[PDB]
Amino acid sequence: PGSIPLIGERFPEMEVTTDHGVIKLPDHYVSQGKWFVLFSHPADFTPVCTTEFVSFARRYEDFQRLGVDLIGLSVDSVFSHIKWKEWIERHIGVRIPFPIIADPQGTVARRLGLLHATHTVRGVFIVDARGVIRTMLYYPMELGRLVDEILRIVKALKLGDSLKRAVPADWPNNEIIGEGLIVPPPTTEDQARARMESGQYRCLDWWFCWDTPASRDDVEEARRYLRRAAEKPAKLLYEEA
Amino acid sequence: PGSIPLIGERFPEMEVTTDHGVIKLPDHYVSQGKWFVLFSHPADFTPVCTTEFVSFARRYEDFQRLGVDLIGLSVDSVFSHIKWKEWIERHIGVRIPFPIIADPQGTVARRLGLLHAESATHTVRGVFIVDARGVIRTMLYYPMELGRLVDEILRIVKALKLGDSLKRAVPADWPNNEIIGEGLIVPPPTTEDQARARMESGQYRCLDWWFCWDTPASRDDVEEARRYLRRAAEKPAKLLYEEA
Amino acid sequence: PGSIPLIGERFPEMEVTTDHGVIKLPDHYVSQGKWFVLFSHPADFTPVCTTEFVSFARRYEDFQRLGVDLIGLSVDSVFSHIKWKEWIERHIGVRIPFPIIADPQGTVARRLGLLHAESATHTVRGVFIVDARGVIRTMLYYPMELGRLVDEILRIVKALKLGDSLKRAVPADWPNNEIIGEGLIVPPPTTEDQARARMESGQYRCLDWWFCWDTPASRDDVEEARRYLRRAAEKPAKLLYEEA
Amino acid sequence: PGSIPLIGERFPEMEVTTDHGVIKLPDHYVSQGKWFVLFSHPADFTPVCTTEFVSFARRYEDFQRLGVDLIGLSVDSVFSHIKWKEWIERHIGVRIPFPIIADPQGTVARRLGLLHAESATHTVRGVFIVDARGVIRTMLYYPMELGRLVDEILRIVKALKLGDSLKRAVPADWPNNEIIGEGLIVPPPTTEDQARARMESGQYRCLDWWFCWDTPASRDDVEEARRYLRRAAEKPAKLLYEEA
Amino acid sequence: PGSIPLIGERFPEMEVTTDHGVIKLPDHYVSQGKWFVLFSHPADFTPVCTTEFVSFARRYEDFQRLGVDLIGLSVDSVFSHIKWKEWIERHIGVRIPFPIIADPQGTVARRLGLLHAATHTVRGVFIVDARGVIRTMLYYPMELGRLVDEILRIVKALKLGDSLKRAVPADWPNNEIIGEGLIVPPPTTEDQARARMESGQYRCLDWWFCWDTPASRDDVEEARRYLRRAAEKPAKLLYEEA
Amino acid sequence: PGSIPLIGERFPEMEVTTDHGVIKLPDHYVSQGKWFVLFSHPADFTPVCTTEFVSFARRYEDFQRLGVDLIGLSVDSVFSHIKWKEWIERHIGVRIPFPIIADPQGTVARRLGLLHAESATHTVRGVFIVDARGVIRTMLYYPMELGRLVDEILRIVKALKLGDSLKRAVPADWPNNEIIGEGLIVPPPTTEDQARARMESGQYRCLDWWFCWDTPASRDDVEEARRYLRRAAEKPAKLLYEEA
Amino acid sequence: PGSIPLIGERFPEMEVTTDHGVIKLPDHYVSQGKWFVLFSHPADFTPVCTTEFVSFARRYEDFQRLGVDLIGLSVDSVFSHIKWKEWIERHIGVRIPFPIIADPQGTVARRLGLLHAATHTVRGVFIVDARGVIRTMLYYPMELGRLVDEILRIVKALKLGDSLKRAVPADWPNNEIIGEGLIVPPPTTEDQARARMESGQYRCLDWWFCWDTPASRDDVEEARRYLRRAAEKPAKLLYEE
Amino acid sequence: PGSIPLIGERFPEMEVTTDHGVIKLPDHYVSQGKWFVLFSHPADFTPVCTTEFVSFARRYEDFQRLGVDLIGLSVDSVFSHIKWKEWIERHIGVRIPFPIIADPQGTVARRLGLLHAESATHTVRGVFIVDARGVIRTMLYYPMELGRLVDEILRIVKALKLGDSLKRAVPADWPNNEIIGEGLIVPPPTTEDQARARMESGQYRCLDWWFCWDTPASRDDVEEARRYLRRAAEKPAKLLYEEA
């Protein structure tokens, strides 16, 4: 075993050195009204980590549209960080635009619990505009992340918050209710009766009510992340690198 | 914060009570040569959890064909588990065929770190993917207001199995990586001599001594993986609420 | 062994989640001038617990008429609690009117010591009788395999309330004691000058200076306790099974 | 709080001095293959306790029919125990044939948890029902101001030995239960296959797969249990004080 | 191997329940000007203890004339105390006039160290003065009854010594060397020692051993009466009349 | 705040240096089959202590008759003990024939618990009576300012040795008890069956089952014990001060 | 306030990963009868550190003719070590021939006490003999590069003292009192002090200050050459290419 | 291992007795705006220590010109230090003009961690270079068999002071570095915007964004530091033992 922050707990407070300067977390994003996604990788000048950085950079306009920032994290120094970014721009042709925390010593990696001896695992923390941890994923060294699933998670959490709904499995392609969204269940017997007397919702039981309150633009932006994940590339970047 | 088992550790050994009977973990599944996905949920008779159990049930054959079993977990009692499953089958039309661990008192949940700060009482939705040797390979922690994408779990296990047999690492968004597509990555050299030898030899497609790759996966394996993601992206042509 | 609150102690202060809402104990009831009987059960959808819920429902207006409320407890979720009450009301035809504590981690159970060697997971059949000052007056611990006799719990609250207002102690098997019948016992002198003065005052029926009693109960009080006992001894004219 | 033995626990081993001789517990009764009811009382030469002794003595052959021995306990010496017994035989006419533990130091009182907030000096009115294997089956805690109902202790022992001998659970208020009367309950299925087999056997009366019952008790078993409750409910013919 | 309060210390402060009511030791007596003898016994309705109680009760106007109260102590209940007192009045013909402490659980017994080598106190006697200070302690066993006239001799001889500022020879008022004489506290310096022998104020065997005879003929005869009583065979035994 | 030895405990094993030599306690006496009386005293060449030495010396043959030895204890050195007994012999005309422990540093005094609040420097007047098995039988604690009555110590030893050979307890003021004179007490029954067999036998004189006695002491035993007390009560014929 | 291993102490036993492979210290070198100088540096792709690697490499043949190996240490990864050696070979034209320890996380630096008053080590230098024993320790700050020829003067003099059974004067081989003289260990007893003064076999200033001249003209001019190189400005600067 | 003060730390505050009197460190030098070099030595009347005091004494003017003071240290007494300096002035003809701490006890040696595993009794040859603010700048630890090169300690204080005023870092072997000669290094950019601003500005000679340099030091400072290395390499013209 080994200790982690938890969902519903605020992001632990800390000042960090990134290749764009020194920032304090979570406060730096909170003050702008932004959510952030923090991801980590074991080592600069490593192949799977480089495939992930490029995937995030291609989907960067997509996170911005939602009001989310990206920040990465490795145990390497700021100097290795910048030497790495320049090698990606010159060899693959893609500029990486977001910061990376430099953590030699592994201080931040231990606080977040990312040590599963010397290099961190591929941990993901999704953190909201009040700085609360909303999801976490832990992939290992030998498997790249699917970045469109991270876009799906973040879009569906902000839509649940704004419409006061829960989000079913595989949304918006759920086999029971497709693009429907779930009313949070009643917690007292009186509340449970009141709900059924209203026939205000579609209803499988007092505890499984649902409606269709999301705009068509919300549902089709979500499905488009999954459509992209499923499509064969038209042109591999290796071909003209 | 909270103490969790870690990637590369053996799944903690424990006797558990399920609605199919008493079992020993990880040994029950190690004994059969199988991998297992253990997923947990806050409470019985709650709507997102129902949608998830129905989603795993629809994909149960695909898990079976890889060699993977499924076991659930929540804080309710086996008698609630059994009553909840009659409900799903009577109203939704779908049979839940896999076991659920009854954890009243929350002993297994504490043992695994499934108790977070969004509730003193009910587990988050954690997932542990465990290999045929008993070893933890991946853990996801989705919150209670958001259901999982179950097709990503199939893509994880299929990619881990290909990686182990072929001795390769797996790129971002495989088998649709934007840089190398369905290609797989050769584990990088860790010495100066080794990195010179890779280059002399000229046997792999190559961007630098640390970024070499090939295409050793079969067309059946690649196609099976594209299938899971096409299905996640497709709208179902008949919805199950339509007939309850 | 295991820790338990004690007769004479105030009920441990605590906030609890019920199927009627969140409340604070013992304050929710102290604030209304009410006694309360808290009783506990090992799990929802189990047969003996169902029989006891139906028997407490039947007597519920007898409790109210005494100024006493009822609250249950078990280790399941408020979602199971509300499912199991709709079942009782559908199939047996009895609506259950009082709240049940949802204690999915066994926190409330560990605070009260309802966790006994029978089961790691689900609580015994415990009963706390609590008065209008929040003070524990009586505790009973029946096992999982044996239901309570509910008319004996009404006899206990009736007798306690009589003893408290009449300043008396209550004989075995009241109001049918084989020595003094429906008599009530004056608390014993604790000094030689008190003992001398009570047998010279000549004011009570008397077996020795330490055993005096009189009969200050109403005909109505007496008849009302004899009623509970007669209902316990009588076979019901109709069983609820017959029309389910 | 304070600590106690628990249901399902072996009665703590201990040597004790009584007014009949020194014994080891629970071995002295286990070794004869006998159940016993150990009961406790704050002090010799007090009124409520005297009413209880007389009531247990009168029902003494009723316990002997069921194979149950009776043992009392208080903080006074063997000397007071024997002077107290003589005063009851001489003034009430009832002689007491069971022993009483002398515990002048509260050694055994503390071991069993019998020292509540009502007093650092004298035990509460505890009852432990212990089977022929030395296991605690049931516990009752009544306070100083209220005498026990002794006929309810006889119903408890009776129904527990019936349970054991038929593999059955015993509903609320048995043998007068409002749902099923004198019927006894089958232990519920704990797996999904056991549950379906029970619904398809048609072997029992059935309200659901988790609530089945039958009427396997003899008429003697049933009518013995109801006779205890009858006696408890009946107004006494002649009171004992009248010729005292 | 066991933990008692000590001669020269204040009797421990405690409140206690007796068959006369609740009282505070040693305050209840301190605030009346009274010494007290607290004696303990293992169990009520036992024979050597009943002998001892009837013996204190017969000498009770003797303690009272001296300004001494009596208080018993045992592990039994107050209900047991009164029933035991009643039997002794009804059978032996003697009323027990003084209070007895109820101590089930033995809390007071332990605070005082009255558990020797499980369950019932031994035969302990504490003699306590009107300042509340422990002056003398006696520990007789279960199988041996006390001599009550010797406890009267101790109380009489301590108050005499407190009053006259003297110490008391062995076997007083019949000491083999100086009779009913009382001893002058010894010199503690070489100059005190020389001046004491220069005054020739006292009968004197060395500068460390001087004495005088300052006790009243009434004091000495009262002390002698207690001892003559302990040596005299009663003419009529109380059993003869039961 | 003082820890001591206890009645019924073995006298604590120790080597001590006396003015007659080094001895081992309680073994020196045990191996001779002898009882011993250990008394202590504040200081050599103090007056009350000198009075006591003289009285113990005068009664020395009395202790020899009973098979009892005497041993003294103070905090001074062996050199003063000897100087001190030379002074007594030349100014009183009486020889002290028994040993005195030299205890500078109060090692033996602390181990005996003889250092009391009256003094930080000098021992109290402690007396241990020790039987032929090495066990503590009685203890008396007189102050600095009040000498012992040596005749009562004689009475205690005669009476204890008599109780032991006859199997009898000894009444207050023996052999002049005001209830039974020179009668000796049968240890009381401890069980009800025992209590009534004593009462059915006419073997003893009885005032109740718990109070039986008889007169098994010899005339010689009885007159010896009364003579110690006859002596304590006689005014001296001649004072040792006069021709000294 | 920091916990370093000490002169005369055995070098701490440990298994380290270097960009030549995993090795064990000091066993790896003791096996060969080699001495070793281990030196540390804050960070790859920083400028003072690079000037120092180039300086040891140019003197690599001198350390080898003495039977001394070289091994570096910094908190970055093996990957960024290999990429840093490629950059220096390509741009400066000098090949780094010795291994560097990768110490992500800080584990080896802490054991050796190399973090003084956050994230990267200071420039410590340990000199370790063929028995595995620490002989000399030097600690220069991050802002100031080492003088490499002084480290050869130390290694050379210590080996001469060991084989000759002699102590070495300040400034050797140009000591102002005895020049290239070497010092006889002093007597430690009154009778050894009288004898030495009687023998008359050595030049002597007092019984505690004796010396002679047992080093060969070759040993002596080798030590001087290290100092003449230090004092001489190079005739062509490498940045000139 | 052992425990040291560290580069970047303020020098440990302490009162010390030297052969010039009592002083406080680091304040005595901080008050005057001076750097100091503290250097330590195993024992007085030893040969390699002596050679080293002589080399420091020759360079006394070179330190004072830089505004740096010298202070020695060993575990001997002031009396020993004084007699040793009189020996050197008379038998070598060189007066030692700086103070030496007398540290008999190794109190100061322990605090600085100068007690190594070479010796239980005498200090190692340690040097602390300390700046005008009190802060430790560089530390060196030569063993008792090897004497220091004093011209390198002069190059280090000189290079460090030029670093501070010019805000530059100093390359290997300065002023004779083989890549940039007497050039000085600009501290590298720490952010990407900053790397790029620097490359496009033409302000510096440049090898890469992280490796920029210039020649801001004057010919007086360059030539002064090359001169200390020149003298170190010079064969002496006269040996001092020659005229001694």
Residue G193 CB burial class (10 angstroms; 0-12, 13-18, ≥19)? middle
SS3 sequence of B67-92 = CEEEEEEECCCHHHHHHHHHHHHHHC
Radius of gyration of chain C measured on its C-alpha atoms: 21
Set of chain H residues whose Cβ sits within 8 Å of the Cβ of A82: 192, 195, 209-210
String of DSSP letters for C176-192:
SBTTTBT-EEPPPP-SH
Cα H131–H136–H141 angle (5° rounding)?
120
Q: Are strands B2-4 and A202-205 parallel, antiparallel or unpaired?
A: unpaired
- Considering all CA atoms of chain A, what is the largest pairwise distance in Å, rounded to the nearest integer? 66
Between chain D and chain E, how many beta carbons pairs sit less than 8 Å apart? 59
Asked if B157 and B142 count as a contact pair (C-beta separation under 8 A), the reply is: no
| Dihedral sign from CA coordinates of F95, F96, F97, F101 | negative
Cβ proximity of C147 and C51 under 8 Å: yes
The angstrom resolution of this structure is 2.2
CB-CB neighbours of F230 under 10 Å:
16
E-assigned strands of chain C?
2-4, 14-18, 21-25, 35-39, 68-74, 100-102, 125-130, 136-142, 184-185, 205-208, 211-214
Please state, in angstroms and rounded to a whole number, the distance separating the CA atoms of residues D83 and D96. Answer: 12
Q: Count chain B–chain D contacts defined by CB atoms under 8 A.
A: 17
Q: Which residue has the tokens 């591999």?
A: A236
Q: Say if CB A231 and CB B71 are below 8 A apart.
A: no
Quick one: tokens of H104? 């008999």
Report the C-alpha gap between A237 and A239 in whole angstroms: 5
Residue B46 CA to residue C79 CA, distance in Å, equals 8
For residue B137, the SS3 value is strand
B172 and A53 Cβ atoms separated by less than 8 Å: no
CATH superfamily of A1-142: Glutaredoxin (3.40.30.10)
- Take residue E26 and report the two structure tokens written for it: 């040693």
Identify any residues that bridge with E35 across adjacent strands, giving them in sequence order.
Answer: E68
Q: Which residues of F are annotated as a binding site?
A: 125
Amino acid, single-letter form, for residue C19: D
CA distance C62 to C60: 5
The Cα–Cα gap between D230 and D228 comes to: 6
Between CA A85 and CA A97 the distance in angstroms is 9
The beta-carbon neighbor of H138 closest among G139, G206, G239 is G139
Chain E CA closest to residue C210: E79
Residue partners of A215: CB distance under 8 A and separation at least 6? none
Same fold across B1-145 and B146-244:
no
CA H75 from centroid of its chain's CA atoms: 21
Reply yes or no on domain E144-242 having CATH 3.30.70.1110. no
Which alpha helices (H) appear in B122-233, and where do they start and end?
Answer: 150-166, 192-201, 219-233
Q: Give F51 to chain E, closest Cα distance, Å.
A: 6
Residues of D classed as catalytic: 49
Token pair in block for residue H214: 């210039």
- The residue among D108, D76, D98 whose CA lies nearest residue D12 is D108
Interface partners of chain F (CB pairs < 8 Å, 3 or more) are D, E
The angle subtended at Cα G41 by Cα G39 and Cα G43, nearest 5°, is 150
Whole-number Å distance between alpha carbons of C99 and A189: 9
Residues 6+ apart with CB under 8 A from H193: A20
Q: In the structure encoding, which two tokens stand for residue A121, read together?
A: 């695992």
Residue B238 is given by DSSP the state: S
CA distance A55 to chain C (A): 42
Spell out the residues 6+ positions from residue B110 whose beta carbon is closer than 8 angstroms to its own: none
CB contact set of B51 (below 8 Å; sequence gap of 6+): A168, A169, A170, A174, A176, A177, B147
How far is D232 from D228, CA to CA, in rounded Å? 6
Tell me whether strands C2-4 and D2-4 are parallel, antiparallel or unpaired: antiparallel
Distances (CA, A) of H140 to B133, F88, H52, H136: 53, 84, 15, 12
Under CATH, domain F1-145 is a member of which superfamily? Glutaredoxin (3.40.30.10)
Kindly state the helix (H) or strand (E) to which residue C225 belongs, with its residue range: helix C219-233
**B49 in catalytic set:** yes
Residue C196 annotated as binding? no
DSSP secondary structure of chain A: -EEE--TTSBPPPEEEEEBTEEEEETHHHHTTT-EEEEE--S-SS-HHHHHHHHHHHHTHHHHHHTTEEEEEEESS-HHHHHHHHHHHHHHT-----S-EEE-GGGHHHHHHT-----S--EEEEEE-TT-BEEEEEEE-TTB---HHHHHHHHHHHHHHHHHT-BB-TTTTSBTTTBT-EEPPPP-SHHHHHHHHHHT-SEEEETTEEEE--S-HHHHHHHHHHHHHHHSPPSS-GGGG-
Rounded Cα gap, residues D51 and D146, in angstroms: 11
Any idea what DSSP says for residue B105? Answer: G
- CA dist B183 and C139 (Å) reads 70
The secondary structure of residue D122, as a DSSP letter, is S
Chain D neighbours, 3+ Cβ pairs < 8 A: B, C, E, F
Q: Do E67 and E35 touch, CB atoms closer than 8 A?
A: yes
The residue in chain B having the minimum alpha-carbon distance to the alpha carbon of residue D189 is B79
Tell how far CA D219 is from the center of its chain: 23
D15: left (phi over 0), alpha (psi -120 to 50) or beta: beta
Cis peptide bond upstream of E5, omega within 30: no
Question: Distance of alpha carbon C117 from its chain centroid, rounded?
Answer: 24
Do the beta carbons of residue D45 and residue D80 sit within 8 Å?
A: yes
For residue A9, what is the nearest residue in chain B, using CA coordinates? B117
Is residue H122 within 8 A of residue H105, CB to CB? The reply is no
CB contact under 8 A, F191 and D19: yes
Q: Peptide bond preceding D236: is omega within 30 degrees of 0, i.e. cis?
A: no
As annotated, the active-site residues of A are 49
Residues G72/G40, Cβ–Cβ less than 8 Å: yes
DSSP track, chain H: -EE---TTSBPPPEEEEETTEEEEETHHHHTTT-EEEEEE-S-TT-HHHHHHHHHHHHTHHHHHHTTEEEEEEESS-HHHHHHHHHHHHHHT-----S-EEE-TTSHHHHHTT---TT-SSS--EEEEEE-TTSBEEEEEEE-TTB---HHHHHHHHHHHHHHHHHT-BB-TTTTSBTTTBT-EEPPPP-SHHHHHHHHHS--SEEEETTEEEE--S-HHHHHHHHHHHHHHTSPPSS-HHHH-
Residue D20 Rama label (left phi>0; alpha psi -120 to 50; beta)? alpha
Q: Which tokens sit at B112?
A: 């695994």
Residue D165, exposed/middle/buried by CB under 10 A (0-12, 13-18, 19+)?
A: exposed
Cβ contact B1:A5 at 8 Å: yes
CATH code, residues E1-143: 3.40.30.10
Position of tokens 């402060």? E13
Separation of alpha carbons H50 and H38, rounded Å: 16
CA-based torsion, A133, A139, A140, A145: positive or negative: negative
Chains G and H touch (3+ CB pairs under 8 A): yes
User: Omega into A172 within 30° of 0, i.e. cis?
Assistant: yes
Cis check: omega of the bond before E26, within 30 degrees of 0: yes
Closest CA to D75 of D130, D120, D37: D120
b vs e for A97-133, b when ≥16 Cβ sit within 10 Å of the residue's Cβ? ebbbbbbbbbbbbebbbbbbebbbbbbbbbbbbebbb
Q: How far is CA G74 from the centre of its chain?
A: 17
Method underlying the structure: X-ray
SS3 content of chain E, % helix, strand, coil (to 5): 35, 25, 40
- Superfamily in which the A143-241 domain is placed by CATH: Antioxidant, Horf6; Chain A, domain2 (3.30.1020.10)
From CA E128, how far away is CA E137, in angstroms rounded? Answer: 9
Residue of F214, F193, F195 whose CA lies nearest to F204: F214
* CATH assignment of G144-241, among 2.10.10.100, 3.40.980.20, 3.30.1020.10, 3.30.70.20: 3.30.1020.10
Strands H35-40 and H68-74: parallel
Q: Which two tokens stand for residue H122?
A: 């005498």
Residue H159 token pair: 């290079």
Of C188, C191, C195, the CB nearest to E21: C191
CA distance A16 to A23: 6
In CATH, what is the architecture of B146-244? 2-Layer Sandwich (3.30)
**Partners of A203 in the beta sheet?**
A209
Q: Which of C188, C192, C210 sits opposite E20 (nearest CB)?
A: C192
Could you state, in order of their start, the residue ranges of all structural domains in chain H?
1-145, 146-244
Contacts of C16 in chain A (CB under 8 A): none
If interface means Cβ-Cβ distance under 8 Å, which residues of chain D face chain F? 17, 19-21, 78-79, 82, 85
The tokens describing B231, both together, are 């299905």
| Least CB–CB distance from C106: residue in B80, B83, B105 | B105
Residue D47: φ, ψ to 5°: -70, -50
